[PDB]
């Protein structure tokens, strides 16, 4: 018995994604490769955001990712900022940005 | 006191009824002082 | 152990 995630080489669960797609009432039928593709895309997005979050955490001399690191990662990357534009991260704060005219 | 005991069983909790009954036992003026009557 | 080509 070999899991579908192992066959596809991914870390996210293909079977769980298939169950969620079936039970989510999205279509009458769900294709075989759709959960694999969706798991791959989810894993890639998680990898990107976690890489940026870890870079922020290292820049902050911290080993564990806190929500502030995730917020800094999302807002500093233009593509992730566009993807998560209408999203508020709890205990995330804001980017340090003081306008030039206000400076002495 | 009888009115509050009747209102106890029907929305006010047992703690609320308890406090109201304690106030009643203290003095009925704690709810409303006797009016000062004057002409209309 | 994992690197993304988006950050090149």
């Amino acid at each position: 018995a070999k899991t579908r995630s192992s066959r596809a080489g991914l870390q996210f669960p293909v079977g769980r994604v298939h169950r969620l797609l079936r039970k989510g009432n999205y279509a009458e039928r769900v294709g075989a490769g759709a959960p694999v593709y969706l798991a791959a895309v989810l894993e890639y997005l998680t990898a990107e955001i976690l890489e940026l979050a870890g870079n922020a955490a290292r820049d902050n001399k911290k080993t564990r990712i806190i929500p502030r690191h995730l917020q800094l990662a999302v807002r500093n990357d233009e593509e992730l900022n566009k993807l998560l534009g209408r999203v508020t991260i709890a205990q995330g704060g804001v980017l340090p940005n003081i306008q030039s005219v206000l400076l002495p | 006191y009888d009115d509050f005991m009747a209102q106890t069983t029907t929305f006010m909790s047992v703690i609320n009824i308890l406090m109201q009954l304690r106030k009643v036992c203290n003095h009925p003026n704690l709810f409303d002082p006797r009016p000062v009557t004057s002409p209309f | 152990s994992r690197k993304s080509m988006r950050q090149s």
Binding site: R86, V87, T88, V94, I98, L102 | - | -
Partner: protein, 81 residues
């Protein structure tokens, strides 16, 4: 519970403005901010109360608030869902 809008305090609004990058604040900003926050809270709370009433519940859970914010277009992370 009455006249609770004054709980939104003037130093609180000043702190929020400073986090927003405001350098100097006029004296009439506070009432406008109180009104804006009152409106926003009214909308979100109305949606959340509708969500709770649908579930035949009387306790407003965090999931209902998250759903209300998502419907308003202000999806919030870290509180489930």
């Amino acid at each position: 519970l009455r006249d609770n809008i004054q709980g939104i305090t003037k130093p609180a609004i000043r702190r929020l403005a400073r986090r927003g990058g405001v350098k100097r604040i006029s004296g009439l900003i506070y009432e406008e901010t109180r009104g804006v926050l009152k409106v926003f809270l009214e909308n979100v709370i109305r949606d959340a109360v509708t969500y709770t009433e649908h579930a035949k519940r009387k306790t407003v859970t965090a999931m209902d608030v998250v759903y209300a914010l998502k419907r308003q277009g202000r999806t919030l992370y870290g509180f489930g869902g």
